[PDB]
Amino acid sequence: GSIIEMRDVVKKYDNGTTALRGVSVSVQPGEFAYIVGPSGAGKSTFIRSLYREVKIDKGSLSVAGFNLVKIKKKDVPLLRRSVGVVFQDYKLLPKKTVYENIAYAMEVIGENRRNIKRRVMEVLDLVGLKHKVRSFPNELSGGEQQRIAIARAIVNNPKVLIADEPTGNLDPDNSWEIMNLLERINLQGTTILMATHNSQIVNTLRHRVIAIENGRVVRDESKGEYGYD
Ligand SMILES: Nc1ncnc2c1ncn2[C@@H]1O[C@H](COP(=O)(O)OP(=O)(O)O)[C@@H](O)[C@H]1O
């Protein structure tokens, strides 16, 4: 079945503003989708709802098998275990080695010695930074920081990866590197939802395009174009 199912989802903030006005999106496993649209359209409310940070007021929403309306807050961490989140403002722990930044998310859930150092070296190979396993974050470039952040978000192998403007703070070439890493992640099966306003990326790296405008899905196309300024 669908890994993300959103039907007639309404999100009203307490100040009367309605960020989502009955949005319906169906995402199969392994899909790679861009979330585009003018600012204030509700892109980030859309994605924030996908890991239960935002609670919807009306409609149905299920992510990775979890009914997000009925999920108990005590279970949201279990939801996050299947739903990794990458941010614009990549922020690693500064007094921790690259290895420790990645290993923390596995130590939390109590993974044993064996799987931790194996899994950390694996994801370090994926992001191509195993040669900096013992470096701290600020000897790392910006693009390298976002790559380690992405490694952290996928260390527990989540089924879904929500990326809010992953390249928003990176120059063109480092953004291509982030997109290539996201692509290889997607090819391994991870469903990737990427909110973005980089039209070059969207138009060269053709994937599904979900365009939101004034809280409503205005466009949902295979290998679509960016379609904005
Ligand atoms: N915490 C909040 N309280 C009230 N209104 C909010 C809140 N967060 C966002 N909004 C409003 O919801 C709408 C969508 O915002 P947002 O989801 O951040 O849009 P986008 O990500 O497309 O820029 C805007 O009108 C914004 O002002």
Numbering used by the authors: 1 to 229
Reported in the publication:
FtsEX is a membrane complex widely conserved across diverse bacterial genera and involved in critical processes such as recruitment of division proteins and in spatial and temporal regulation of muralytic activity during cell division or sporulation. The component FtsX is an integral membrane protein, whereas FtsE is an ATPase and is required for the transmission of a conformational signal from the cytosol through the membrane to regulate the activity of cell wall hydrolases in the periplasm. Here, we provide the first three-dimensional (3D) structure of FtsE from the notorious pathogen S. pneumoniae, and we show that it presents all the conserved structural motifs of the NBD members of the ABC transporter family. The nucleotide-binding site is located in lobe I near the interface between the two lobes and presents the nucleotide sandwiched between the Walker A and B motifs.
FtsE was crystallized with ADP in two different crystal forms (P 1 and P 21) and with AMP-PNP, a nonhydrolyzable analog of ATP, in the space group P 21. The FtsE–AMP-PNP complex was obtained by soaking with the P 21 FtsE-ADP crystals. The ATP analog was found in two out of the three independent monomers of the P 21 crystal. Structural comparison between our ADP and AMP-PNP complexes revealed that there were no relevant structural rearrangements directly associated with AMP-PNP binding, e.g., monomer M2 in complex with ADP and that in complex with AMP-PNP were nearly identical (RMSD of 0.22 Å for 223 Cα atoms). In the presence of AMP-PNP, K43 interacts with both the β- and γ-phosphates. The γ-phosphate is further stabilized by a direct interaction with the switch histidine (H197) and with S39. The catalytic glutamate (E165) is positioned directly adjacent to the γ-phosphate, consistent with a role in ATP hydrolysis. In conclusion, the residues that recognize the ATP molecule are properly oriented, and no relevant changes were required for nucleotide exchange. Other conclusions can be drawn from our structures; in particular, we have observed that while the relaxed structure of the FtsE-ADP complex nicely fits the equivalent complex in the MacB dimer; the monomer of the FtsE–AMP-PNP complex requires rigid-body adjustment of some regions around the central β-sheet in order to get a perfect fit with the more compact structure of the MacB-ATP dimer. For instance, in our FtsE–AMP-PNP complex, the γ-phosphate is far from the Q88 residue of the Q-loop (>6 Å); however, our composite model for the same structure in the dimer indicates that Q88 would directly recognize the γ-phosphate, as also occurs in the structure of the MacB-ATP dimer.
